Structure 1
Amino acid sequence: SVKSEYAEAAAVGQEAVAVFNTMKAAFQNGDKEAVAQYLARLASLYTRHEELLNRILEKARREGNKEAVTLMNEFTATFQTGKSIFNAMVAAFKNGDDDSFESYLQALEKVTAKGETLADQIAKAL
């Protein structure tokens, strides 16, 4: 069901949270080789999450589930904010700009905590 596809999507999202926090520890410790690998892993996890979210939104639309579509439109919008900040974080790592990396990192943590009530609302609406 779309609801079980959203649970699969949620888990992938939580995997990115898990890796992201491990990455943050590596960054603070100066283990740049680890950070590079974690950033690669996170790109794969975000790409997969984005795709699952789009399939869920498209299915909710085909089902006529207006409330779920409204919530998923808000949610996917926020996901594009994370994407843009994540992209700038990766660029800051490439450029050796630790100040920008720190900034973007705290931004992404706010994105995830800011949207978790909406994430839970979606589960109940699908």
Structure 2
Amino acid sequence: SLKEKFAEYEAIGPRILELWQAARNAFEAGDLARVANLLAELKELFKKDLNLANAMAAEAAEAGNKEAVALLAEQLERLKKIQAMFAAAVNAFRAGDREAFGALLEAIINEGKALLPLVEAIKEAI
């Protein structure tokens, strides 16, 4: 059910954000092994997050819950942006482009931080 799905979703976002912060700490220290591991952990979690968000959006539409549909639409649009910067960042990390990678990590984290209040609103709205 929707609250069931949201209950699963609620805990994913902060685990993802913790990994991005861990990736930036590792990168700034030169620990390139660990950055790669973290990026690989993030691929699987971020895929789960997006699958769950899309599932919640579809269920909120089925229920005719206008304001959850709108909040989930914002969430999905922001996640799609992070997804593209993530793809860009892995490509930059593999190319050895430190300027591109550091810039994208910073931007990704800034986007992720902004999702926590939106998840809070989604909880109220469902």
TM-score in terms of structure 1 length: 0.95
Partner of 1:76: 76
Pairwise CA distance, 1:110: 1.3
Pairwise CA distance, 1:99: 0.4
Structure number with the bigger relative contact order (C-alpha 8 A, sep ≥ 6) is 2
Partner of 1:104: 104
**Any unmatched runs of 5+ in structure 2?**
none
The Cα offsets for residues 58-86 of structure 1, whole Å up to 9 and x where unpaired, read as 00111111110011011100110111111
Partner of 1:19: 19
For residues 108 and 98 of structure 1, the distance between their equivalents in structure 2, rounded to whole angstroms, comes to 15
Q: Determine what percentage of the aligned residue pairs are the same residue.
A: 32
Between the two proteins, the alignment pairs up a number of residues equal to: 126
Partner of 1:117: 117
- Aligned CA RMSD, in angstroms, stands at 1.1
**Any unmatched runs of 5+ in structure 1?**
none
For residues 120 and 4 of structure 1, the distance between their equivalents in structure 2, rounded to whole angstroms, comes to 15
For residues 50 and 62 of structure 2, the distance between their equivalents in structure 1, rounded to whole angstroms, comes to 18
